């Protein structure tokens, strides 16, 4: 089709304010601030009334429209994280070898393995062992990408060593996803 013009709109809650120069995101709100570089996408931002930012692409195509829509998706995710804040919950179980998670995140005694597993804490993500709930860890952070990457790394670096995939139930999984608010 080769659309001559295409644009989308981003909702801006009163609690947050944004300013974009040279494709630089500056999301500021009650839960802190976040930034991201979108220069490689070559999209254009346009303010209208300090409450809605237009992201538009001219003479683009499906390849460029995909990046344009991804820009809006990332902006919405950043706004939600700065406002509500994401809370990734992860639960771990053990058939016969307790997983003595300890602090930096460390994992011990997985399937009786002597080796110690650990994943460094990333920026913008916090770790809080679940209270009262048995063998549960609750993660939180304004940046969805960092929290999700930390959860994926924790779930991947601790896996069965090429044994039966059904008999061995030990592991760590994302039990629930929610928001801080």
């Amino acid at each position: 089709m080769k659309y001559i013009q295409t644009e989308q709109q981003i909702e801006v809650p009163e609690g947050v304010t944004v300013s974009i120069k040279s494709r630089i995101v500056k999301v500021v709100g009650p839960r802190g601030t976040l930034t991201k570089n979108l220069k490689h996408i070559d999209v254009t931002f346009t303010k209208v009334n300090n409450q809605l930012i237009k992201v538009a692409v001219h003479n683009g195509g499906r390849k460029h429209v995909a990046a344009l829509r991804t820009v809006k998706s990332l902006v919405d995710n950043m706004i939600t994280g700065v406002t509500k804040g994401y809370k990734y919950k992860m639960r771990y179980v053990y058939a016969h070898f307790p997983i003595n998670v300890n602090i930096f995140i460390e994992v011990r005694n997985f399937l009786g393995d002597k080796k110690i597993r650990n994943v460094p804490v990333r920026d913008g993500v916090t770790i809080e062992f679940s209270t009262n709930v048995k063998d549960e860890i609750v993660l939180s952070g304004n940046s969805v990408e960092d929290v999700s990457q930390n959860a994926a790394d924790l779930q991947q670096i601790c896996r069965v060593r090429n044994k039966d995939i059904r008999k061995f139930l030990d592991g760590i999984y994302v039990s629930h996803k929610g928001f801080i608010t």
Partner: protein
């Protein structure tokens, strides 16, 4: 640079009439003779071209959404095709169609037949989005990444592409 000519024939009657687009009258006559065989059974020696006259646009100062029906002989037979083109004159509209066909289908003057060209004076009649997008109310769009033909071999300012 094509030109529009009206060519008629009658094999020396019904006075068959059709519109031919060619760069010159000589090519127009040849195309008319070729189309005569397809339309009916006639030969060049049968008669003579009764009259050939170039047709100029009534007013080459108005933008018209030309609707064109074109049949072309592809590598696997001939198929009927219809398209709409936004232009100012029929001569330019047909040339644009020829260039588009040569760019995509690689069909050229040899294997392209022009059936009918008619303007569209009402919106929503054009069913092609690439023309429909230009039929809206006065719009505005930029021209990003503009460039300048630097005659000098060397530059000292690091030119910018802004418009």
């Amino acid at each position: 640079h094509f030109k529009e000519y009206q060519v008629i024939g009658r094999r020396l009657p019904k006075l068959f009439r059709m519109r031919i687009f060619a760069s010159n009258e000589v090519i127009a006559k040849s195309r008319y003779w070729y189309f005569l065989q397809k339309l009916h059974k006639v030969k060049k020696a049968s008669g003579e071209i009764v009259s050939i006259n170039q047709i100029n646009e009534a007013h080459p100062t108005k933008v018209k959404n030309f609707g064109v029906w074109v049949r072309y002989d592809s590598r696997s037979g001939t198929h009927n095709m219809y398209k709409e083109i936004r232009d100012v004159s029929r001569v330019a509209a047909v040339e644009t169609l020829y260039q588009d066909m040569a760019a995509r289908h690689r069909a050229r003057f040899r294997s392209i037949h022009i059936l009918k060209v008619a303007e569209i004076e009402k919106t929503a009649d054009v069913k092609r989005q690439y023309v429909k997008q230009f039929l809206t109310k006065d719009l505005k769009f930029p021209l990003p990444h503009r460039v300048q033909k630097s005659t000098k071999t060397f530059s000292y300012k690091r030119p910018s592409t802004f418009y």
